[PDB]
Design a protein around this nucleic acid. Sequence first.
RNA 1: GGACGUACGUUU
RNA 2: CGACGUACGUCC
Length: 647
Amino acid sequence: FKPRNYQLELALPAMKGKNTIICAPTGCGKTFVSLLICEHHLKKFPQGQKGKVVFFANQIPVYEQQKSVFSKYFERHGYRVTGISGATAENVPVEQIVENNDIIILTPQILVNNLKKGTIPSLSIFTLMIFDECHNTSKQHPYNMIMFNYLDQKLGGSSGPLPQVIGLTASVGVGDAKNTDEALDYICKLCASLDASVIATVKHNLEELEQVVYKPQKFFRKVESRISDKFKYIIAQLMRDTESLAKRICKDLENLSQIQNREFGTQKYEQWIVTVQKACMVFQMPDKDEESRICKALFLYTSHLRKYNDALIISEHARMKDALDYLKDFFSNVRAAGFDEIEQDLTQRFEEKLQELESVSRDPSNENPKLEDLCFILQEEYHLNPETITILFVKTRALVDALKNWIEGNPKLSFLKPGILTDHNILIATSVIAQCNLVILYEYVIKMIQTRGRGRARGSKCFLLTSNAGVIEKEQINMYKEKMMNDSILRLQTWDEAVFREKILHIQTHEKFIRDSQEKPKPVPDKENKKLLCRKCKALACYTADVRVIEECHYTVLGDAFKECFVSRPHPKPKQFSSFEKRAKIFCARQNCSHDWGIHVKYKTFEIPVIKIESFVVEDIATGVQTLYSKWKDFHFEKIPFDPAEM
RNA sequence: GGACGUACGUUU
RNA sequence: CGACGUACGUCC
Ligand SMILES: [Zn+2]
């Protein structure tokens, strides 16, 4: 409630009436700077005129937090504060909200959708655009699209009452720059994309930030992996047998994906599996039934190989028993789907191998040395200080649960309590305040950024465990980049204003140039009637003449004959988006297919099965080729809009 | 469902 | 120096 020199020096360049790239690591500091700038902006206007400051929050939690803070602050001043979110902008006059409010905190995607539709034609209605975590303004972000619209309206020659573009962040960032030249070039490009000539950074009151800055210390621990990999050897033999028995129907399986040699349990092998799957999903045997059987068998074999590769990665990273548990869970989930010859062979082979796999996994001599040293350093820190709440960063959503199960089943430790955030001593998270003075990045590659919210100094460690010193060197150069970016900011604060502005202007110019150069024309709409087939079944789903478009993004089918071609399933997490209500999922209605086709929702009153071309193959009736797309934007055809007059 | 970003990996 | 695959996170 009382502004200090630290909170005032960052806002001093912003009160003069110029854009800024204010960089404050303190979470409370950013909110206080927001409030002070908003007060000084709405108070400096004379009678008759009024501000329309807009705050762009990226996430819903920080959005609601800023909304509550602004509504609690600007109450006695006589200012109307509101909010527009994803669950609040449904059939609501956003134009009337903007015209009757002054401190709207609408998220950026809402403003992008409004600019695309036609509501709020010019941004000149606003007067002060305060972004949150502005360093995301890089490419195709909602922030970047709002800035593209602003720069277009500015350089177009109709620059009216343009709003201020004061941005707030914690780290300006470097990206892929190598030397100070490319670092300064990237920072200048960001400053031009956000249209500012000042970067507010503390230089005279560094002690106020050093008091609470949350600067931890790194303790990189390069450790080795297992040696006697009996589990990995058995899984590799199983995968070799599976590939050998799968090559009986496709003699040219090796000629479909030509990259390099492949090894089981690698991301390269996973990519090769996905590529050979997408290559075997386009077969054109004229039988149309044996072809479907061969495609289904190849899809099942490839899915089994992918699951085995995922199990090998889980065995390499987390405990050995967790990989066997994941394989048993996958086999139990596929057992309750269908029983054909392919499943009756694969599941029976896995059951034959499980009698040895369980005996190998239950051996205490095959424990991961990475998990061993992890529990070692954990118990070390815990008996050194028994009041250290920790956070453990994991890469995979399966490993973040495997480590929780390991901690729950580890006899060497009992004080730990799993606090998974995909009565809580350890918080095993995957990707992200004022607490948790211990971080353990377990094979997870800035990603430990905690200086965006509330923080506290006086004790913080940033242990990093890994198996490849590569990653170590990576983090090293990362710290290097941190330093160099600091230096670059210093240089910018040493630069003059006018020339700087001129430079950034030229930058924006070139940018717009590139933009107008990268403007694809309308795709030539195909006039033929191509049909879509299932991925793992190759069954006739629907013709492109019965496909309708809702909002240039969603695709449905109006064919009543299609209504019996799928089955419904209760959605694991129903939620609303824009104008839809996610009610259920639609899967393939075949013997043992159960392929994920799409999602059954309700648009306004009508029930529609919104499908995804990703889970579809395109076969033309004129030519005969079977092309395979990923996104609807890549599929070019007669995109007929959704006409509610028909159904 | 669609868009966006990040990380890893493969390639002309 | 562009596309591609995966994982993660966000948004509408
Ligand atoms: Zn099917």
